[PDB]
């Protein structure tokens, strides 16, 4: 009993995983993966754009049926929703201006303005660890706003997924003067283990269909054909 049309929510301001092209078509690695999996599930799929923090609310209220949006699989989120198997890995890392002394440490960040996406694992981490101790942590409605304010000099740093900052900003014209500030911030408690399709806890049939399709496209080498369009390293981790 899978629906005829599976409605998939995503936030299109997180290139190279999810954004929109010049005509306003959805593009990116999350979109490619979702469409391949729908093709193997033999369902029809509609993509529904949303703000990142509205995705899990819309899922719970049945306005969409699945979330593919670099949604990290964390212990907190599993208390609310279910997840497919891992689609790819996702570490977190700070970016600041090139030459910045900034490190991902309280002592370095106290009194700085750090941008984080509202609803993200990074907002959770920064609020507990940094906002309480005097770092000016600013939550943003979407990631594009964060990159804008950083280049505007309104932010000193921004915490987001590492590959999104890399491919989506630092290797782009806009990010030429910026760089990663320190190594990735590892914290198992906050950042989870890779990303997956978020689904309602009771939609086990739909979880099984996505997992079967993900295993099939990984097995035959499709995942890697698709990943190579965007990455030259192994995005899956392993
Ligand atoms: N399309 C997006 N905005 N994705 C943001 C993902 C950020 C982080 N991985 C999280 O799960 O909270």
Curated annotation (Swiss-Prot):
One of its GO terms (molecular function) is amino acid binding. Disulfide bonds join 38-45. GO terms for biological process: amino acid transport. Its main location: periplasm. PROSITE patterns: SBP_BACTERIAL_3. L-ornithine binds at residues 11, 69-70, 72, 77, 121, 161. Changing residue 52 to A: Shows a drastic decrease in arginine and histidine binding affinity. It holds the Pfam family SBP_bac_3. L-arginine binds at residues 11, 69-70, 72, 77, 121, 161. Has a bi-lobal structure. Contains two globular domains separated by a deep cleft wherein the ligand-binding site is located. The complex is composed of two ATP-binding proteins (HisP), two transmembrane proteins (HisM and HisQ) and a solute-binding protein (ArgT). This is Lysine/arginine/ornithine-binding periplasmic protein. It comes from Salmonella typhimurium (strain LT2 / SGSC1412 / ATCC 700720).
